[PDB]
Amino acid sequence: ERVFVWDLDETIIIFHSLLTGTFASRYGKDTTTSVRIGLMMEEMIFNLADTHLFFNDLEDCDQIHVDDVSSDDNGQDLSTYNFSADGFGGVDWMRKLAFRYRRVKEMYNTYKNNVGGLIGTPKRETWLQLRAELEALTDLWLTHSLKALNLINSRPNCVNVLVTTTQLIPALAKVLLYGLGSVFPIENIYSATKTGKESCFERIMQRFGRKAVYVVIGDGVEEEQGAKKHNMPFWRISCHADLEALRHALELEYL
Amino acid sequence: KIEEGKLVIWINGDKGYNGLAEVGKKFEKDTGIKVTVEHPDKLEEKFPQVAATGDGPDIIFWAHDRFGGYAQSGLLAEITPDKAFQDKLYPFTWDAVRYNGKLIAYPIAVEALSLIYNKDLLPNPPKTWEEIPALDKELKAKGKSALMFNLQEPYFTWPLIAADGGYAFKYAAGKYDIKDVGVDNAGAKAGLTFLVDLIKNKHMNADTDYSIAEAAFNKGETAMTINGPWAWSNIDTSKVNYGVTVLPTFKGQPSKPFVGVLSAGINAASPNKELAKEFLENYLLTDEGLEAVNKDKPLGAVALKSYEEELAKDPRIAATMENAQKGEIMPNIPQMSAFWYAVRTAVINAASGRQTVDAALAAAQTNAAAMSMLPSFGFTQEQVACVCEVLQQGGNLERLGRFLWSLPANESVLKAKAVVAFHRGNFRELYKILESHQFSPHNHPKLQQLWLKAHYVEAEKLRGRPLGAVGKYRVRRKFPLPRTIWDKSRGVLREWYAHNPYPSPREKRELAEATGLTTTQVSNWFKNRRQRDRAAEAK
Ligand SMILES: OC[C@H]1O[C@H](O[C@H]2[C@H](O)[C@@H](O)[C@@H](O)O[C@@H]2CO)[C@H](O)[C@@H](O)[C@@H]1O
Numbered sequence: 001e002r003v004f005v006w007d008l009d010e011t012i013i014i015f016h017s018l019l020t021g022t023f024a025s026r027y028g029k030d031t032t033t034s035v036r037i038g039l040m041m042e043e044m045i046f047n048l049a050d051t052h053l054f055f056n057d058l059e060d061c062d063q064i065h066v067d068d069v070s071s072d073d074n075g076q077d078l079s080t081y082n083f084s085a086d087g088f089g090g091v092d093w094m095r096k097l098a099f100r101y102r103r104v105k106e107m108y109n110t111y112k113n114n115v116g117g118l119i120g121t122p123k124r125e126t127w128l129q130l131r132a133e134l135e136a137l138t139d140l141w142l143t144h145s146l147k148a149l150n151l152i153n154s155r156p157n158c159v160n161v162l163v164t165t166t167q168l169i170p171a172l173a174k175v176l177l178y179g180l181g182s183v184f185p186i187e188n189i190y191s192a193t194k195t196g197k198e199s200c201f202e203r204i205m206q207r208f209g210r211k212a213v214y215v216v217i218g219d220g221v222e223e224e225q226g227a228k229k230h231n232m233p234f235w236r237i238s239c240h241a242d243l244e245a246l247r248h249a250l251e252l253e254y255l
Numbered sequence: 256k257i258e259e260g261k262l263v264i265w266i267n268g269d270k271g272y273n274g275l276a277e278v279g280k281k282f283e284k285d286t287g288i289k290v291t292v293e294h295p296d297k298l299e300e301k302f303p304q305v306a307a308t309g310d311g312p313d314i315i316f317w318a319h320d321r322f323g324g325y326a327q328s329g330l331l332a333e334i335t336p337d338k339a340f341q342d343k344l345y346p347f348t349w350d351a352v353r354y355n356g357k358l359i360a361y362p363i364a365v366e367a368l369s370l371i372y373n374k375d376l377l378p379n380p381p382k383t384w385e386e387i388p389a390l391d392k393e394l395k396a397k398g399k400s401a402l403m404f405n406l407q408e409p410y411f412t413w414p415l416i417a418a419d420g421g422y423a424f425k426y427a428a429g430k431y432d433i434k435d436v437g438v439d440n441a442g443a444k445a446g447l448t449f450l451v452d453l454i455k456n457k458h459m460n461a462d463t464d465y466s467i468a469e470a471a472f473n474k475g476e477t478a479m480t481i482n483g484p485w486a487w488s489n490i491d492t493s494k495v496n497y498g499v500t501v502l503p504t505f506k507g508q509p510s511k512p513f514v515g516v517l518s519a520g521i522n523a524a525s526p527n528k529e530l531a532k533e534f535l536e537n538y539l540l541t542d543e544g545l546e547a548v549n550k551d552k553p554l555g556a557v558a559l560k561s562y563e564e565e566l567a568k569d570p571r572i573a574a575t576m577e578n579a580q581k582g583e584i585m586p587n588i589p590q591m592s593a594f595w596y597a598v599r600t601a602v603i604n605a606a607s608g609r610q611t612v613d614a615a616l617a618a619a620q621t622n623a624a625a626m627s628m629l630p631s632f633g634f635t636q637e638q639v640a641c642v643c644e645v646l647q648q649g650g651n652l653e654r655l656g657r658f659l660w661s662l663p664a665n666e667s668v669l670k671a672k673a674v675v676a677f678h679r680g681n682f683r684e685l686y687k688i689l690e691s692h693q694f695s696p697h698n699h700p701k702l703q704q705l706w707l708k709a710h711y712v713e714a715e716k717l718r719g720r721p722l723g724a725v726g727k728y729r730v731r732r733k734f735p736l737p738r739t740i741w742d743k744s745r746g747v748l749r750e751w752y753a754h755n756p757y758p759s760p761r762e763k764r765e766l767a768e769a770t771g772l773t774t775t776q777v778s779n780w781f782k783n784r785r786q787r788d789r790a791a792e793a794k
């Protein structure tokens with residue numbers, strides 16, 4: 001019934017604005033602390049993407065959605081499949097592309113509530129420490145967005161979907177590293193990198209039907225214009241206060 | 256802004272506003288300060304809406320129960336009567352307008368509902384509610400009915416609901432406990448059930464309102480009604496041989512009306528606070544001031560001791576105080592608004608058959624408690640608009656009504672108010688909303704349907720039989736869509752008009768060519784479009 005269509009960066013998470021300096025300036029924080037946290041998280045994202053999610057293979061052939069690849073994939077078990085040795089638009093090539101996304105889906109489902117297990121020790125400890133410094137620097141931004149997401153998650157006829165400008169594979173790494181894996185099924189994540197958000201919003205409406213109420217949440221003009229186009233109510237997150245206000249509305253079931 | 260050097264006064268339309276204007280005239284003669292009395296609709300809700308902006312009346316009159324909310328909103332000036340003045344009014348009336356130790360209004364008079372009965376039809380009025388079905392049977396034989404009273408305002412039905420144990424907020428430890436609401440208990444259910452059964456068994460109609468009840472009693476069609484002292488002067492005029500007496504008992508217990516004290520507050524935004532005080536203390540609250548208002552529409556048992564000594568000799572006033580003493584003085588706390596909202600919904604829904612008594616009251620309990628506990632957090636206009644659109648799209652119209660109620664001190668809100676008004680059958684308020692603001696073209700279709708459907712509902716009821724195709728056609732002709740919600744070749748025309756609303760003769764010829772229309776048609780379209788845009792500016 002209620003489909004919440006979320007944006008990722010500067011809506012649910014603070015990341016890109018740590019690298020650019022704008023979070024620090026807008027929230028009165030130390031620029032040095034901010035960029036350092038951002039750089040460290042950036043490294044963890046690329047490291048996870050490359051090491052576990054085939055990002056070197058998939059970088060120039062990434063998808064809008066994890067189920068997009070059409071191939072003769074027979075569903076064979078890939079737990080002993082040797083990706084490094086398989087030589088990856090023909091039939092064979094598409095099947096190897098499809099294999100990687102199916103495997104990415106398996107990994108995501110296996111490790112969404114065990115990211116520490118996925119990246120291992122000592123990365124796990126560095127990650128947890130970094131996540132704690134992030135919360136302090138951002139005055140609990142992620143803590144607050146998670147509360148909103150989980151509140152929505154707990155309600156019978158509500159669903160969370162994510163539309164991001166980040167390419168799918170690194171977006172998955174971000175989602176994992178920011179603890180968003182348990183709130184977002186991988187099938188509910190869409191990358192607008194090549195296609196633009198409008199097109200993703202249309203996929204979403206096709207999927208959930210013309211009876212659902214779509215609520216668009218984001219800081220950006222692109223999701224706002226997409227919302228307007230399809231008469232979806234829009235809740236702007238222009239600053240942290242807008243997120244707290246969203247939490248109040250959700251608690252009172254105004255949304 | 257409120258004009259300095261004038262007094263504007265608001266009082267309800269059922270009160271003696273013409274008599275009050277008489278006091279105003281004497282005031283103006285003495286002081287040079289013109290006084291204007293108004294009785295706008297939904298006054299109790301309009302005051303906070305307009306006072307908030309620093310606008311509205313200098314002086315506001317309503318029962319005291321609304322005043323805590325006003326004070327908490329910062330809408331009221333504290334009032335400064337001296338010991339000499341305070342001594343002239345009964346202590347229990349001052350209590351009704353005391354809020355956190357502060358007097359926040361002047362008390363005027365005590366209002367309690369009584370049983371009003373036709374002594375010709377009914378020299379011995381029923382002592383009990385239980386004996387009323389049997390009495391109605393007996394009277395229906397003679398072309399009469401036993402009882403009619405306003406079933407639209409929960410003020411009138413509360414005495415019965417409260418009789419066997421219903422209550423608003425529990426009083427304990429010197430304060431009303433806003434977490435202990437009593438609208439859902441055994442006693443409240445018994446009372447509302449008895450009411451609904453009266454309606455089921457054809458002894459009353461769920462659609463009876465104030466006007467219908469008044470008309471029937473004053474025409475001698477019904478033997479009894481339930482009303483306050485303000486109603487008595489119309490009955491005088493009707494020459495009906497009426498008595499005023501104690502309300503019937505229910506399950507051996509007195510009906511317990513919620514007792515109001517008509518009060519006059521000073522707008523905190525008023526530039527005339529000292530003139531307002533002089534008016535209230537030295538003109539209105541005197542034997543001559545109150546008599547003038549009372550003569551228009553009776554005030555009830557007035558707060559002013561000197562004048563009440565004379566009114567108390569009246570058996571109608573005696574009965575008023577007896578009912579008041581058996582009932583309960585309303586709380587003045589801010590949460591009374593939530594209480595009345597919730598109970599209003601329940602009585603209407605239960606009486607109409609829409610919900611069972613049990614379901615209606617269960618929801619009222621939950622709503623009153625939840626609304627009374629809402630945090631003061633404010634949303635931006637954009638956020639309010641978003642909520643309004645989501646709740647509409649979700650079909651959550653009851654939630655939407657409560658959300659609108661919560662808004663403190665835009666198009667989306669107005670559209671929401673219209674939808675809710677329609678949902679409630681408040682068609683007059685709906686039409687007011689639809690006509691008073693220009694709406695965006697994309698909102699027209701939905702708003703048009705509300706206008707049409709409501710008018711069909713009203714027409715079909717006046718007809719007593721289903722509206723057919725021709726009937727609907729006639730309603731449409733009689734009540735056209737207001738211009739506030741109503742206006743391929745057009746495509747070319749609209750895009751052109753945005754660049755230039757005044758094409759030359761040659762440009763008209765080119766447009767006629769491009770649209771397949773004649774130049775006469777092009778000209779007419781442009782003229783019409785300019786007229787309409789102008790009409791829309793004026794809003
Ligand atoms: O119906 C709920 C309503 O009851 C009271 O309003 C009374 C008012 O006190 C009387 O002066 C008279 O005018 O009739 C009104 C009912 O129509 C409460 O004062 C009011 O706040 C409440 O909403």
Ligand SMILES: [Mg+2]
Pocket residue numbers: 007008009010011218219220
């Ligand atoms: Mg963003």
